[PDB]
Every structure is written in structure tokens, then in C-alpha cells.
Amino acid sequence: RIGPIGLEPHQFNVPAELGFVEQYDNLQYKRYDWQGWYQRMLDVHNRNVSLRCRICDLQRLDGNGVQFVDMQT
Amino acid sequence: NVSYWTMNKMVRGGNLLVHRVHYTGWGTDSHLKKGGWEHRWNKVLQRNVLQYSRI
Amino acid sequence: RKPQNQWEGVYYYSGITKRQRHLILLHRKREREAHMRSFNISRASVLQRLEQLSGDRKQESLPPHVRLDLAVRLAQHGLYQQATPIVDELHHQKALHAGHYALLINALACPRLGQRILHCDAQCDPALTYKLLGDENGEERAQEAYRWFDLALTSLAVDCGHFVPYLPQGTAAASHITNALMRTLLTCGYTHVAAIPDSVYDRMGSMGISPTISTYELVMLALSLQGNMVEAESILSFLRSHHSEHITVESFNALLLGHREARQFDCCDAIWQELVDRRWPRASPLTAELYLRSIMDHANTPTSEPLQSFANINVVEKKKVPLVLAQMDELGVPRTHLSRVLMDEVEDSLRKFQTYRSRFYEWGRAVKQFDFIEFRRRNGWLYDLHLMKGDIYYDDTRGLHDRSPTWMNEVPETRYDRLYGVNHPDIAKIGIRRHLNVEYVNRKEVVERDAALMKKTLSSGRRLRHRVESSR
Amino acid sequence: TEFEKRMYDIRHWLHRQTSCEFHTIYRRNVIHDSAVFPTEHDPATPTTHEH
Amino acid sequence: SYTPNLTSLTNQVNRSERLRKWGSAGVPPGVPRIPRLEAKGIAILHESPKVILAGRSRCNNFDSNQYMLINKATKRCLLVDASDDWPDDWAAFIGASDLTLTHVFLTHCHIDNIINLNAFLTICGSRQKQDEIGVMWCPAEECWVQNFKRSCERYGRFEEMHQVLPMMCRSLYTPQHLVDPVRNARHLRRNDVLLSAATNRATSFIDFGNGVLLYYIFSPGHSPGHMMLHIPTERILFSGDLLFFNKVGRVDLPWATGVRLAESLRLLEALPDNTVVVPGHGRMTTLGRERRENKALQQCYQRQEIGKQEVSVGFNEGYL
Amino acid sequence: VMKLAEDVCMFLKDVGRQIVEEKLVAVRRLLQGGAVDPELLAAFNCARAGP
Amino acid sequence: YHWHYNLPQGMERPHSVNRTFAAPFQSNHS
RNA sequence: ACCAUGAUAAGGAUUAUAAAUUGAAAGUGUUAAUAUCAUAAUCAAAAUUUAUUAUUUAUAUUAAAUAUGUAUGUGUAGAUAAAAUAAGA
Ligand SMILES: [Zn+2]
Ligand SMILES: [Zn+2]
Structure with missing residues (x-):
């Protein structure tokens, strides 16, 4: 699992999901002078990345011993 | 993005790939048969924009 | 329009010029001269140091540590014959001790001659350095390594003069010299590296000397050079079961080297993926060198069951090289700590299989595609390989027609249009009208035009029929 | 990444007039730095709708 | 067209003429x-x-x-x-x-x-x-x-x-x-x-049945063997490629002679004007219309009158 | 798309079995025995107050 | 002339053009 | 550009010997009238955009009038869920 890991007590580790779309053409826009703007048009249209995290994974203990997310949090 | 005269000659020429439906039906997409052109007009909005929780 | 080929790859530049390959070969010969020049300068310095302390100190007896310092420096530079009269008088004067004997046998493996053999002769292959060190007096240095081992154990019995019937075989000095013996015997020929897991290891067991982790790693490296992998993995399996705290990197370096010699490239992948998974012990640059060289030996290996009908299949194994180099960035292994012979083949795989996002937006332009065609047209004789010349498991009696209503669902428009006059006696069965059976876009309009043409033809034919026989 | 490399290279031997797109949902560790993003009390003069 | 030999592949004008006629495709x-x-x-x-x-x-x-x-x-x-x-x-x-x-x-x-x-x-x-x-x-x-x-x-x-x-x-x-x-x-x-090729009015015919005879006429120039069909009872002449409406056949194809085509146009001057000539291409005409308003037949007899021994008539743009 | 989905799935079955198997041979060596990473040991002893 | 839709849409033959021809990088810009 | 296209109308026949099924419905032949501009040497109608006392059909505005006498269409349209004054000489 990639991502940075914090060992200091002021840094909490949140295991989260990232969903993204990568799309490349292979039929007509695979290679020609139109491939430059069409591949960029596919990347801008697929610019979405979904950052998902469970609230159950946020209910862990912090570096100071207190819970990260309590009921009121 | 052509006119009605150009669309028939592409059909009669065989260039594009289109499936013919009976001219009094609504095709095969269930969203078009349900509410018409306006219901499919809202379904593309639900796919492009409204399925994303914007930040 | 004529269709373009979708299984034809994009034309991109993956190669070097003839000047650049000549300049790589010219620059690599200069540093091979530089390592040859660096060794012979220091070899002449220790030989001048030897003749100075033999000539001007002819009658003046030297202190034993100066003669010990010169004896290890002679043995490191491959001069074992100039050092054996020095160690014979130091053993006779009883000036050598437990650490001094292990220093001399470790010096007898020559870790200065092996540095010249690595950069110049072995082409920076760490497996080939053991194969080439065995020629420069491999049997001769092995006999003196066995003689200095007998000089060591005789001195350890004097130095230990309770545990009295178990001395010096139970001390730390007995295994340290035995680990020094196996390290020196690895640099010898094939007859002595084969004797390390069989003859030296049973002699260590018969003498009752407790081994260490460096004992098993040199035995695993000895079985790696022989090509016996069923025994080399069994030793680490003994280490995985009993002594798992002390396993260092060199046991993995023996297994990466060993499957490279046995040409089992699927096994050496699993050892590298294991080392990325556990991340302890730390991956040395010798780990990245031994694994990447196993990729290049697998990539340059020809196959013989398709017999290369189209191209070389094993060249696709160089696509893993950008994956391994990305793993080295997170393991803390610097890619600048790779040898010059390997780094040219690593960058050979990089310009063949790697692209950036800025280049991927510009690599398919028609100017670069048509430059590839003309450069193949102008000079293709310089760069070409061809120009050189229900549930089925509980189903058995299937339930058919279970009254599933197809009339609640609506698929009413399944009308099909067949050609006119299939069973007509005047219309022939074979004809060019049979090609109308394969037509999908204008299926409705063609066959109704075909039926209108065939109805009017049979009407005009039968009205010509009635006119001719009524006139005669 | 050996499976991600093999999955991305299926585009080169697809069928006639048949394309594909790839979706990847992977787990990634995210750090919430409580020093760069601290939990502070609200200010004395709070913000309004005019901000 | 023809076999691509060594000098046709090394010629620049072969790559240039295929660019002029068919554009960037080069293949007809x-x-x-x-x-x-x-x-x-x-x-x-x-x-x-x-x-x-x-x-x-x-x-x-x-x-x-x-x-x-x-x-x-x-x-x-x-x-x-x-x-x-x-x-x-x-x-x-x-x-x-x-x-x-x-x-x-x-x-x-x-x-x-x-x-x-x-x-x-x-x-x-x-x-x-x-x-x-x-x-x-x-x-x-x-x-x-x-x-x-x-x-x-x-x-x-x-x-x-x-x-x-x-x-x-x-x-x-x-x-x-x-x-x-x-x-x-x-x-x-x-x-x-x-x-x-020895076609005469006596014996060179096909008995079609019930007394109609199909006199075939050898008339080369557009092709080596060009057999017209003449039905004298019905005033019908299947000229094929020899004579069309206001034009004649091509000579710019192989085994097509211009002076053989002019002799083929002269061997139909004994037929009447109401003979409806039925060509292989285009609209049908009469032989009397082509004797008046066809410039290929007009040039064929004008060169004959002024003394051309080898009268060469023929088209280079038309039907195959 | 149905016949391609039989072509890609059989490809990803034989490839996906191979990559899991070379991962399965790495877990069974890690379960037989190994030494703990001191960077991993310092990660557990990182917080000030524990549970 | 074309490929029909009821035929199996397999790849007819693979093309290895980039591995038979190793081209060096040639740009008109410096 | 004067080709021999194609549209209109009209008459013929075959099958139901079952009360089951959501559902007893589908295939094959002849005569009259109308009509036929593609193997040749060009160009901006409404290719085509915009505006002024003026030409229409539509758009909505739009009214008086009991002294007498008085004012009937063809068509245009939307989805389609009643039926016997004419002679099978
Ligand atoms: Zn002809
Ligand atoms: Zn012809």
C-alpha cells in the first residue's frame, strides 16, 4: 500500500481509497496528428479521482492516546 | 452533426453503423421509452455531473 | 476510406546511433584502462615496499606488526608467494594470534586483484569474478589456505593452554578462521568451491566447531556456483526455521546469483519480490545488480519452440526494468550504485520501454511517424534484424421451458426480411443475388427493391410469354 | 505493478473496432497533519455572510 | 495497368503521375x-x-x-x-x-x-x-x-x-x-x-430460325476481333463499340489501330439510313443520323477526299 | 464484446494465477520465519500515550 | 474488402516494427 | 444533358372439422392509363449574409346595427375505443 507514513504523534494515518479512470484510444485516435488533443481530452474528461474513507477507520487512537474521531467528532 | 440529406446518403452508402427501428417506437433504451426525450436529457446530466459529490 | 491497422504499434524512437554505441565502447575502454592503471601502480608500490624492507633491513629484525602489515598487503594484491616466508617466521616466532590468522586467510582471497578482475575482465559480473579468480593460482592458494588453517588450529591449542577437551573447537576463533577459510576457498577453482559444502563443512562438523551466519552464507554461495538449487534453498529453509533473527543480505545474494547460473529466471523473480515484501534485511546494490543482470540474461535468451517466427519473444522481459527501478526508489537503493556495464543495458531497456506524459501527447504526430518511415527507407540496412542476413454442478437433467413469460417483457420488433422467390421455379437458386443475404444497414430497402425488380421481371417475362404464343 | 503493467497492455491486441477503458480502485495511506492543519479555537470576531 | 518492373519502380514520374490522377491515394x-x-x-x-x-x-x-x-x-x-x-x-x-x-x-x-x-x-x-x-x-x-x-x-x-x-x-x-x-x-x-474474319453478305450469317439471318461483320480498329451484328430484315445494326451516338470507339488501348477503325467505318456506307444502329454504350441512333451529325465520320471522309492514304480516326476519351 | 470478455478473462486468469502464486510462495516463506524490521518496530513504539 | 460482424474478431497477425527497427532519436529542433 | 427509369388503379388463389393456448393467423400470380434530359466544356437562385415610403397570406387587435327584407365551402388539423333508402339483370 503506497502513501506516506507518519510516526510523529501529530500525524495520523488514514487508510483511504482512490478510484480513477485511465482511458487510451487504440482504434482511430491511436496515432495521428489528432492524437495530441484527443488524448488530452480523454485525460481532462477523466480528471476525477474519488477519495473515499470509512468513518470506522477514523475512529482509532491518535499519537497522544486520545481517539482521533469520537462520537461528537 | 449532419443534415437529413447527408444522413440518408451515409445510410444508403453504408459508411456509418446504425440500427433501424420501427418509426413509431422509442428505440431500445429504457430511459427514452419511459419519459421521452426529456427523461434521457436528464439522465446524461445525472451521469456527467450529479453523480459526483463536488468539493 | 481504407482502414488503419490497430494492431500495428506507434512508431517511436527506441535506439542509439552508431556514433553513440562507438562512444560508449570507447569510454568503457578508458575506465578499463584506468582500473588496470590503478592496480599496477599500487602493486608496484607494495613490491617496492617489500624489497625496501628486505634490502635495507637485511640484518635488522623488524617488529612483527610491520611484517604482518606487509604480509596481508602482498596477499591482497595476488602475491601469495612473496608472503608465505613472512607468515612462516611469524608462526615460528609465535607472534601471530587468533585474529591475525583470520586476517591472513581473508587476505589470501585477494580483495585487490578481484577489484581489477571485476571492472576489467569479468565485465562487472559478480558471479564471473569467482570464476576468473580461480585461474590465478586457484589450487596453489587453496593449499596455502589449508596450510594456514593448520597453522591456525595448532596456535589456538597453544593459546588455550574449564572446557579442556572441548578447546579450541568451541571458541569464537575456531569458526572465524573456518569462515575465513571458506571465503578464501570460494575464490579458488571449481574443485575447491565444490569441497566447501561437502568436505570443509563435514570437517567442521567432525571437529565440533559451531558455525555462524557467515558459515552458511559461504556454503550457500558455494552451492550457488555449482548450480545446485535444491540444497541452497534448503539451508535458508533451515535458517528460516531456527535462526531467523541473524539472516543477513548475503543469503539472498547467493540465491539471486545461484538461480542466475542455473537459468531459472522464474525463481529469481520470486526472491526479489520476497525481498521487496519483507524489506529486512536491506537491499544492497549487489541485490539490484544480481537481479537486473538476471533480467538481461533472460531477455537475450533465444527461444526455440516457436523458433522466432516473427520476432524475439523474450525481449518483453525488459519491460519489467522500469518496474524494478521504481521499486529501488522506495527501498532506498540508489540507481547510481550500478555498474557501467549494467547501466548501459538498463538505459537500453528504458528507451525501449518507458515514456513520459509530455512525450505521450506528442509521440503520435504524423511528422514523427513519417520520419520513421523515411529513415527506414533511407538507411534500414544499418538498423534491422532482417537486413543483416442453472448451477451446472447440480444440473444434470436440465429443466426445460419453465413457463417464463416472454410476453410480459416487450421485444416485439424482431421482423426479418428474406429474399424474394426462394421456392419459385423460375428464379434460380444460385446467383449473384445470394450476396444480398449479407447486408445489415440497408436490409429493409434493398430487398424491397430486389422484390420489386424480380416481380416486374417475372411480370414482363410472363407477359412476353403470353404474347408470342398467341401471335403464332 | 506487474499485474497493472499486464492489464494496461491488453489494448494492443483487442478485437476489431473494440476499445476499452480501465478503472483502478486502490488503497492509499493519507496523513492528516495536525500541525499543518491544526484544531484551533474559533476567533473572537467570527466571520459572517459578508465574507 | 502493367507489370511493375525495375525501371517503373525507380522512376519518379511514375510516383508523380499517380499523385496527379488519384490524389494522395496513388492507387486507382x-x-x-x-x-x-x-x-x-x-x-x-x-x-x-x-x-x-x-x-x-x-x-x-x-x-x-x-x-x-x-x-x-x-x-x-x-x-x-x-x-x-x-x-x-x-x-x-x-x-x-x-x-x-x-x-x-x-x-x-x-x-x-x-x-x-x-x-x-x-x-x-x-x-x-x-x-x-x-x-x-x-x-x-x-x-x-x-x-x-x-x-x-x-x-x-x-x-x-x-x-x-x-x-x-x-x-x-x-x-x-x-x-x-x-x-x-x-x-x-x-x-x-x-x-x-472473311465476312461476306453471302454465307457469313447465323440462322436464327424462321428465316432471319444474323450477318456478322468483321470490323476491327477498336479491338483485334470486332464482330458487329446486322439484321437486314429489321434494320438493326449492333455496332458494339464501333459507332455510338456522335462518337466512335477508343484507339488509345492496346491492339487498337486508328487506320483499321477508319476502314471499319467505311464498310457500313452501303446500308440504308433507317438502319437503327444499336451500340454497346449509351443511347441508340440511326445510321443516317451519324452520316450527317457525327464529326468522327465527317473527319474520316474529309481526310479521304484531300488525299490521305492512311486515314487515322479514333477516340482517346470515351468507352472501353 | 461477449467473445472478447471470454478472451480477456482467460488471459487474466492464467496471468492472475501466476502472480498470486509467486506472491503465495513469498508469504509462506515469510510465515516460516524472518527478522522484524527495526523501522517497523519503531513504528509501533511511536505514540506518546498508548491504549 | 471488409470484415463481417459474425466472424470472430481476432487479431490476424502481430506486428513487431519497433523491435525490428531500432530508431535513434532524431528531432529537427536542437 | 432529351436512353430503354419509376410511381397509380384494377382483378386471383391455399389452410383451418381443435374449447387447448398469453396469443387459431400467415405466406404465393395477371391488365389498362401516366411517365422516362447523366460521356457533356463554366460561373455565386434562397453559394449566400444584411437593410429602406412599398406586394401578400397569416399574428393579434378590432366596432356599430331590431323601420322593412335577408345571407350555409372546398380545405386546413390532432389522436383515433358509433355504423343497413341501395339492387350479384
Ligand atoms: Zn471495347
Ligand atoms: Zn464497350
Whole structure:
């Protein structure tokens, strides 16, 4: 699992999901002078990345011993 | 993005790939048969924009 | 329009010029001269140091540590014959001790001659350095390594003069010299590296000397050079079961080297993926060198069951090289700590299989595609390989027609249009009208035009029929 | 990444007039730095709708 | 067109002339088959108490014509230059009219005439199963039946390439095969007529039945063997490619002589003006109209009057 | 798309079995025995107050 | 002339053009 | 550009010997009239955009009038869920 890991007590580790779309053409826009703007048009249209995290994974203990997310949090 | 005269000659020429439906039906997409052109007009909005929780 | 080929790859530049390959070969010969020049300068310095302390100190007896310092420096530079009269008088004067004997046998493996053999002769292959060190007096240095081992154990019995019937075989000095013996015997020929897991290891067991982790790693490296992998993995399996705290990197370096010699490239992948998974012990640059060289030996290996009908299949194994180099960035292994012979083949795989996002937006332009065609047209004789010349498991009696209503669902428009006059006696069965059976876009309009043409033809034919026989 | 490399290279031997797109949902560790993003009390003069 | 030898591949103007004619493609688009759309029906052109002429105009994308003579008494039909992109209407027309297809007349063996000849004999030969159809042609066209496969490569007719022509098969004028004694649908074609170039008004005719005679006239210049059809009782002249409306045939093709074409135009000056000339291409005319308002015939006799010994007339832009 | 989905799935079955198997041979060596990473040991002893 | 839709849409033959021809990088810009 | 296209109307026949099924419905032939501009030497109608006392059909505005006498269409349209004054000479 990639991502940075914090060992200091002021840094909490949140295991989260990232969903993204990568799309490349292979039929007509695979290679020609139109491939430059069409591949960029596919990347801008697929610019979405979904950052998902469970609230159950946020209910862990912090570096100071207190819970990260309590009921009121 | 052509006119009605150009669309028939592409059909009669065989260039594009289109499936013919009976001219009094609504095709095969269930969203078009349900509410018409306006219901499919809202379904593309639900796919492009409204399925994303914007930040 | 004529269709373009979708299984034809994009034309991109993956190669070097003839000047650049000549300049790589010219620059690599200069540093091979530089390592040859660096060794012979220091070899002449220790030989001048030897003749100075033999000539001007002819009658003046030297202190034993100066003669010990010169004896290890002679043995490191491959001069074992100039050092054996020095160690014979130091053993006779009883000036050598437990650490001094292990220093001399470790010096007898020559870790200065092996540095010249690595950069110049072995082409920076760490497996080939053991194969080439065995020629420069491999049997001769092995006999003196066995003689200095007998000089060591005789001195350890004097130095230990309770545990009295178990001395010096139970001390730390007995295994340290035995680990020094196996390290020196690895640099010898094939007859002595084969004797390390069989003859030296049973002699260590018969003498009752407790081994260490460096004992098993040199035995695993000895079985790696022989090509016996069923025994080399069994030793680490003994280490995985009993002594798992002390396993260092060199046991993995023996297994990466060993499957490279046995040409089992699927096994050496699993050892590298294991080392990325556990991340302890730390991956040395010798780990990245031994694994990447196993990729290049697998990539340059020809196959013989398709017999290369189209191209070389094993060249696709160089696509893993950008994956391994990305793993080295997170393991803390610097890619600048790779040898010059390997780094040219690593960058050979990089310009063949790697692209950036800025280049991927510009690599398919028609100017670069048509430059590839003309450069193949102008000079293709310089760069070409061809120009050189229900549930089925509980189903058995299937339930058919279970009254599933197809009339609640609506698929009413399944009308099909067949050609006119299939069973007509005047219309022939074979004809060019049979090609109308394969037509999908204008299926409705063609066959109704075909039926209108065939109805009017049979009407005009039968009205010509009635006119001719009524006139005669 | 050996499976991600093999999955991305299926585009080169697809069928006639048949394309594909790839979706990847992977787990990634995210750090919430409580020093760069601290939990502070609200200010004395709070913000309004005019901000 | 021709075989790509070494000097044609190393010539720059071969790569340049293919850029001028066809643009950036460089390959000439062929002459395709007419589909089942944009196709007309078989028309009855002439009805007479002796014979019946039924025809179809523009049956190919070469703009060729397909005709058939129907004898009223013998119920025997005869195709002239059998080249239709759909020889399925012609099989249904003879099947619904109680006709018997006995011979196929061919004026000349260009690709505008014998492109669907194997399709004509197969489809019409299959209907008579529930005596085969003959081919009447001139042996001077032997050079054009060898290059029938070359003509199909240039005009994109790849489906009719690998088809042995029925006139190339062993007829009665050929030596026979000596087959092993342990199959004559393709081994021997007994119904085959080879027309001679010595065509006269006395004996060079085909007895069509009930007293009408089809006098074939040898008239080269557009092709090595060009046999017209003349029906003097009905004032009908199947000129083929020799004479069209206000134009004559091409000479810019191989084995086409301009001075042979001018002699072919002079051998029809004894026929009356009401002889309705029926060409292989385009609209039909009369021979009296072409004697007045055709510039190719006007130039042919003007050079003859001023003293040209070798009068050379002929087109370079027109029909094949 | 149905016949391609039989072509890609059989490809990803034989490839996906191979990559899991070379991962399965790495877990069974890690379960037989190994030494703990001191960077991993310092990660557990990182917080000030524990549970 | 074309490929029909009921035929199996397999790849007819693979093309290895970039591994038979190793081209060096040639740009008109410096 | 004067080709031999194609549209209109009209008459014919075959099958139901079952009360089951959501559902007893589908295929094949002849005559009259109308009509036929593609192997040739060009160019901006409404290719085509915009505006002024003026030409229409539509758009909505739009009214008086009991002294007598008085004012009937063809069509245009939307989805489609009643039926016997004419002679099978
Ligand atoms: Zn001709
Ligand atoms: Zn012709």
C-alpha cells in the first residue's frame, strides 16, 4: 500500500481509497496528428479521482492516546 | 452533426453503423421509452455531473 | 476510406546511433584502462615496499606488526608467494594470534586483484569474478589456505593452554578462521568451491566447531556456483526455521546469483519480490545488480519452440526494468550504485520501454511517424534484424421451458426480411443475388427493391410469354 | 505493478473496432497533519455572510 | 495497368503521375459492381413479327448495355455482349417466357463484355437443368482473353479474377484431353462457334430460325476481333463499340489501330439510313443520323477526299 | 464484446494465477520465519500515550 | 474488402516494427 | 444533358372439422392509363449574409346595427375505443 507514513504523534494515518479512470484510444485516435488533443481530452474528461474513507477507520487512537474521531467528532 | 440529406446518403452508402427501428417506437433504451426525450436529457446530466459529490 | 491497422504499434524512437554505441565502447575502454592503471601502480608500490624492507633491513629484525602489515598487503594484491616466508617466521616466532590468522586467510582471497578482475575482465559480473579468480593460482592458494588453517588450529591449542577437551573447537576463533577459510576457498577453482559444502563443512562438523551466519552464507554461495538449487534453498529453509533473527543480505545474494547460473529466471523473480515484501534485511546494490543482470540474461535468451517466427519473444522481459527501478526508489537503493556495464543495458531497456506524459501527447504526430518511415527507407540496412542476413454442478437433467413469460417483457420488433422467390421455379437458386443475404444497414430497402425488380421481371417475362404464343 | 503493467497492455491486441477503458480502485495511506492543519479555537470576531 | 518492373519502380514520374490522377491515394479506385439499389429493369426495346429485341441500358459502371434477341417461332434467345452486373433478372426473364438460351454473341472480348460471362453461363445453365449455352466469338480476341485477369486487377474486379473463361476451354476446334480410363462439363464444350474474319453478305450469317439471318461483320480498329451484328430484315445494326451516338470507339488501348477503325467505318456506307444502329454504350441512333451529325465520320471522309492514304480516326476519351 | 470478455478473462486468469502464486510462495516463506524490521518496530513504539 | 460482424474478431497477425527497427532519436529542433 | 427509369388503379388463389393456448393467423400470380434530359466544356437562385415610403397570406387587435327584407365551402388539423333508402339483370 503506497502513501506516506507518519510516526510523529501529530500525524495520523488514514487508510483511504482512490478510484480513477485511465482511458487510451487504440482504434482511430491511436496515432495521428489528432492524437495530441484527443488524448488530452480523454485525460481532462477523466480528471476525477474519488477519495473515499470509512468513518470506522477514523475512529482509532491518535499519537497522544486520545481517539482521533469520537462520537461528537 | 449532419443534415437529413447527408444522413440518408451515409445510410444508403453504408459508411456509418446504425440500427433501424420501427418509426413509431422509442428505440431500445429504457430511459427514452419511459419519459421521452426529456427523461434521457436528464439522465446524461445525472451521469456527467450529479453523480459526483463536488468539493 | 481504407482502414488503419490497430494492431500495428506507434512508431517511436527506441535506439542509439552508431556514433553513440562507438562512444560508449570507447569510454568503457578508458575506465578499463584506468582500473588496470590503478592496480599496477599500487602493486608496484607494495613490491617496492617489500624489497625496501628486505634490502635495507637485511640484518635488522623488524617488529612483527610491520611484517604482518606487509604480509596481508602482498596477499591482497595476488602475491601469495612473496608472503608465505613472512607468515612462516611469524608462526615460528609465535607472534601471530587468533585474529591475525583470520586476517591472513581473508587476505589470501585477494580483495585487490578481484577489484581489477571485476571492472576489467569479468565485465562487472559478480558471479564471473569467482570464476576468473580461480585461474590465478586457484589450487596453489587453496593449499596455502589449508596450510594456514593448520597453522591456525595448532596456535589456538597453544593459546588455550574449564572446557579442556572441548578447546579450541568451541571458541569464537575456531569458526572465524573456518569462515575465513571458506571465503578464501570460494575464490579458488571449481574443485575447491565444490569441497566447501561437502568436505570443509563435514570437517567442521567432525571437529565440533559451531558455525555462524557467515558459515552458511559461504556454503550457500558455494552451492550457488555449482548450480545446485535444491540444497541452497534448503539451508535458508533451515535458517528460516531456527535462526531467523541473524539472516543477513548475503543469503539472498547467493540465491539471486545461484538461480542466475542455473537459468531459472522464474525463481529469481520470486526472491526479489520476497525481498521487496519483507524489506529486512536491506537491499544492497549487489541485490539490484544480481537481479537486473538476471533480467538481461533472460531477455537475450533465444527461444526455440516457436523458433522466432516473427520476432524475439523474450525481449518483453525488459519491460519489467522500469518496474524494478521504481521499486529501488522506495527501498532506498540508489540507481547510481550500478555498474557501467549494467547501466548501459538498463538505459537500453528504458528507451525501449518507458515514456513520459509530455512525450505521450506528442509521440503520435504524423511528422514523427513519417520520419520513421523515411529513415527506414533511407538507411534500414544499418538498423534491422532482417537486413543483416442453472448451477451446472447440480444440473444434470436440465429443466426445460419453465413457463417464463416472454410476453410480459416487450421485444416485439424482431421482423426479418428474406429474399424474394426462394421456392419459385423460375428464379434460380444460385446467383449473384445470394450476396444480398449479407447486408445489415440497408436490409429493409434493398430487398424491397430486389422484390420489386424480380416481380416486374417475372411480370414482363410472363407477359412476353403470353404474347408470342398467341401471335403464332 | 506487474499485474497493472499486464492489464494496461491488453489494448494492443483487442478485437476489431473494440476499445476499452480501465478503472483502478486502490488503497492509499493519507496523513492528516495536525500541525499543518491544526484544531484551533474559533476567533473572537467570527466571520459572517459578508465574507 | 502493367507489370511493375525495375525501371517503373525507380522512376519518379511514375510516383508523380499517380499523385496527379488519384490524389494522395496513388492507387486507382476500381470499377465496382452495381448494387441491387440504383438498378433498373429489363425493357422491351423492339417487337417485330419475326424477332423481339429486349434490352437494358447502363447495366455496368462501364456504362455498357445488355441486349437479347428473342425469336418468336423457335422460342430461342441469344445474348449479345453478355455483361450485366446482375444476370439474375435475365435468368428469370428467360425462365418466365419459356425461352431456350442456345448461344451468346460477343462482339469483342474487352472487360466491358465478358466480365460476367461465367456468371451468365452458370446461372442460366442451372435453370435449364430443371444442350448447353454456346459462345460465338472471334479468335483474334485471344490476346484479350489472356489479359482478362490483368484487366480485373486494374478495375478492382477481384472476384472474377480466378475464373477460367469458357471460351478458353477445349472446344471442337481444339485437341481433346486424354484422360485416364478409370466429366465433360468442363473438358469439352461442343457448342462453340469461332467466327472468321472473311465476312461476306453471302454465307457469313447465323440462322436464327424462321428465316432471319444474323450477318456478322468483321470490323476491327477498336479491338483485334470486332464482330458487329446486322439484321437486314429489321434494320438493326449492333455496332458494339464501333459507332455510338456522335462518337466512335477508343484507339488509345492496346491492339487498337486508328487506320483499321477508319476502314471499319467505311464498310457500313452501303446500308440504308433507317438502319437503327444499336451500340454497346449509351443511347441508340440511326445510321443516317451519324452520316450527317457525327464529326468522327465527317473527319474520316474529309481526310479521304484531300488525299490521305492512311486515314487515322479514333477516340482517346470515351468507352472501353 | 461477449467473445472478447471470454478472451480477456482467460488471459487474466492464467496471468492472475501466476502472480498470486509467486506472491503465495513469498508469504509462506515469510510465515516460516524472518527478522522484524527495526523501522517497523519503531513504528509501533511511536505514540506518546498508548491504549 | 471488409470484415463481417459474425466472424470472430481476432487479431490476424502481430506486428513487431519497433523491435525490428531500432530508431535513434532524431528531432529537427536542437 | 432529351436512353430503354419509376410511381397509380384494377382483378386471383391455399389452410383451418381443435374449447387447448398469453396469443387459431400467415405466406404465393395477371391488365389498362401516366411517365422516362447523366460521356457533356463554366460561373455565386434562397453559394449566400444584411437593410429602406412599398406586394401578400397569416399574428393579434378590432366596432356599430331590431323601420322593412335577408345571407350555409372546398380545405386546413390532432389522436383515433358509433355504423343497413341501395339492387350479384
Ligand atoms: Zn471495347
Ligand atoms: Zn464497350
